[PDB]
């Protein structure tokens, strides 16, 4: 009846999945597409005890096992379709003229999305609507806005990362949380970690939330505690066993761990809308202190950040509070950590976009604003990746089809701010396209971006803490 979204979304995704793979025409050491191809290559030609040791200077495996296994499966299938593509040590830099193997990879991304991202968010919106007894048209719109989140759609297709999988897995975790299937929620979580360690950002929530709910909230229940301890440890064991047993043993476990969390290098070498990338340009941390002081200050900052949310979670676990506190903790992590790159913002964008289902107007307005901002702060990467056009294509599309031509909150303060930032974004897009930097320090516009994003995200996270504290009024939870 409504499945039209289920197909126009996929059409949109595949239409974007025609752009340039990252690092196109990058002779020495190609972009990310080459990394994925290379991991799929070397996973199907070496024993299990030699996936992490093979070539640690050329895109050596970097993610937890599940990435390895998934890439191994896809490599098997691609070999079946054609083995000449995965020539070990020979097809290192494959560039076909007829666009072979590109449509293949894009199909892989699409299928992974469809399997692990679509149904989660769809069923979740179904659940919320069902509970709040809203018009089916409303729920259809509340799903079609989500699935067209521009940032994620762009970064998966074209830039070629599988963020969708881990995102959808944590979505399944949240769902299972709603329907109280806690023992399955923990397992969906531990699955989401093992695909990309980057999804540890929500652990400070799920820890306290499961703790309070099972152990403490209704009563001092005990059974479910051993239940979840059983389940999570079981997940870790069954996902790491092929390494220890079928491989070098504890040596390979230690190598895997220290290869997931490599030691820090350099200081503030990447321009991201972090907290230090901004204040580094005034205070010049490089000289003020050593490196260990900064790695301790960043840790203390992140802990101070996500602590109040954890305390409030342990204090008042309620289903109508999750997206707020997930945003609190995810943003606390992405705002103060030491080495963050240009993405990861998607990982806060999960519990942001999960809010479309809300009934208030301010929240929807804010969420659309912040999604536009996030889409913006990724422009440098895209620009230096091709995608001259698809940026604005999706930029337009998403804002149009969400009903932006009739729009802003009911408060001039917020209105003034939103419009000002929109001007700024429009403004900046000139100062690079035709203006050259003062040449006294050329890479300025990018630092202007590192800056203009920070204000937005900071005020957003503050409003998230706000919405936490102002709410908790035992509101109907039908919100």
């Amino acid at each position, epitope marked *: 009846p409504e499945y039209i979204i289920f197909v126009c979304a996929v059409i949109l995704r595949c239409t974007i999945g025609l752009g340039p793979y990252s690092g196109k025409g990058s002779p020495p050491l190609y972009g990310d597409f080459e990394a994925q191809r290379h991991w799929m290559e070397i996973t199907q030609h070496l024993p299990l005890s030699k996936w992490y040791w093979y070539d640690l200077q050329y895109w050596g495996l970097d993610y937890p096992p599940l990435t390895a296994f998934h890439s191994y499966l896809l490599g098997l299938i691609g070999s079946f379709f054609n083995p000449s593509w995965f020539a070990l040590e020979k097809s290192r830099g494959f560039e076909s003229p007829d666009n072979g193997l590109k449509t293949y990879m894009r199909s892989t991304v699409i299928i992974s999305d469809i399997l692990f991202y679509f149904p989660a968010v769809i069923y979740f919106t179904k659940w919320l609507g069902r509970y709040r007894n809203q018009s089916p048209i409303g729920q259809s719109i509340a799903a079609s806005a989500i699935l067209f989140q521009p940032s994620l759609m762009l970064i998966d297709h074209g830039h070629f990362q599988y963020n969708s999988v881990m995102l959808g897995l944590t979505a399944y975790a949240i769902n299972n949380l709603l329907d109280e299937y806690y023992a399955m929620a923990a397992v969906c979580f531990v699955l989401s970690i093992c695909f990309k360690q980057m999804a540890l950002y929500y652990a400070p929530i799920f820890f306290a939330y499961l703790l309070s709910r099972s152990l403490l909230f209704p009563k001092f229940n005990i059974a479910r505690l051993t239940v979840i301890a059983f389940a999570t440890l079981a997940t870790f064991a069954i996902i790491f066993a092929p390494l220890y047993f079928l491989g070098g043993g504890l040596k390979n476990i230690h190598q895997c761990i220290h290869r997931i969390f490599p*030691f820090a290098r350099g200081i503030f070498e990447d321009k991201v809308a972090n907290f230090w990338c901004v204040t580094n340009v005034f205070v010049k941390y490089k000289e003020r202190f050593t490196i260990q002081q900064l*790695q301790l200050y960043s840790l203390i900052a992140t802990v101070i950040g996500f602590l109040p949310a954890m305390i409030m979670t342990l204090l008042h676990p309620k289903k109508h509070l999750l997206p707020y506190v997930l945003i609190a903790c995810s943003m606390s992590f992405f705002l103060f950590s030491f080495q963050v790159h240009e993405k990861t913002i998607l990982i806060p964008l999960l519990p942001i976009t999960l809010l479309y289902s809300s009934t208030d107007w301010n929240v929807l307005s804010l969420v659309s604003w912040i999604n536009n901002v996030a889409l913006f702060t990724l422009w440098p990467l895209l620009k230096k990746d091709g995608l001259h056009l698809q940026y604005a294509v999706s930029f337009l599309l998403s804002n149009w089809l969400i009903g932006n031509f009739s729009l802003l909150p009911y408060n001039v303060v917020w209105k003034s701010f939103i419009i000002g930032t929109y001007i700024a974004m429009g403004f900046y897009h000139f100062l690079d396209q035709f203006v050259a930097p003062p040449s006294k320090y050329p890479d300025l516009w990018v630092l202007l971006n590192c800056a203009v994003g920070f204000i937005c995200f900071s005020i957003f996270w503050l409003w998230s803490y706000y919405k936490i504290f102002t709410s908790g009024s035992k509101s109907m939870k039908d919100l």
Partner: antibody
Amino acid sequence: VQLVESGGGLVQPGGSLRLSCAASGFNVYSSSIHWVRQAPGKGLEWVASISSYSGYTSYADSVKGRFTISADTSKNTAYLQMNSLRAEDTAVYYCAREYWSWYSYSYGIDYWGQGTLVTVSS
Amino acid sequence: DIQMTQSPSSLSASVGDRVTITCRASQSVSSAVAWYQQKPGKAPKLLIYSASSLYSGVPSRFSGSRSGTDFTLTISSLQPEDFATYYCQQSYWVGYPITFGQGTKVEIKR
């Protein structure tokens, strides 16, 4: 808990060598081998290194290209290949372990090889 | 780029005396500086690491410190069996080249 060196003797300029360093009872994939050379009657001087987790060779600004470090944890071995061997490269060479940890917290250069002689002459 | 200036070139002091060696850094972006001792012929032996931690296996008459960019080592009760050459050694972080001092030789005063 005691390194050993091997490979050392006269080599004419333009020659080549490959010094080997074998460990004893400590993994060599968690130690970040260095090769510290000492010229005769002069002070210590670092040459090449490794990170043991991400193959981050870093060669001193005098040995760009002419040398090449390598490791192998299959047998707790570390190698230093040498290709040019100008006349002044004559020295003593030690392999040296250094155990980092979390938060870039060094632990210094615990274990030193006993030291090999290298004489570059014609 | 990276180096350290070890001062002074050469001291002399008889037993019981207390003496101090300085090591002016170049850019204070790391606090991992070790102090080594070398007898003639042998291979150097670690004394102090992380700029203040005395190694386990060394008499406690040694004491290090950091002063902004001017690391410092002190020996309180200089014994006669402590005459060797002492080396300041800095390492920035994992994949970054390290650098040694220029050499400091204690010897007897007479």
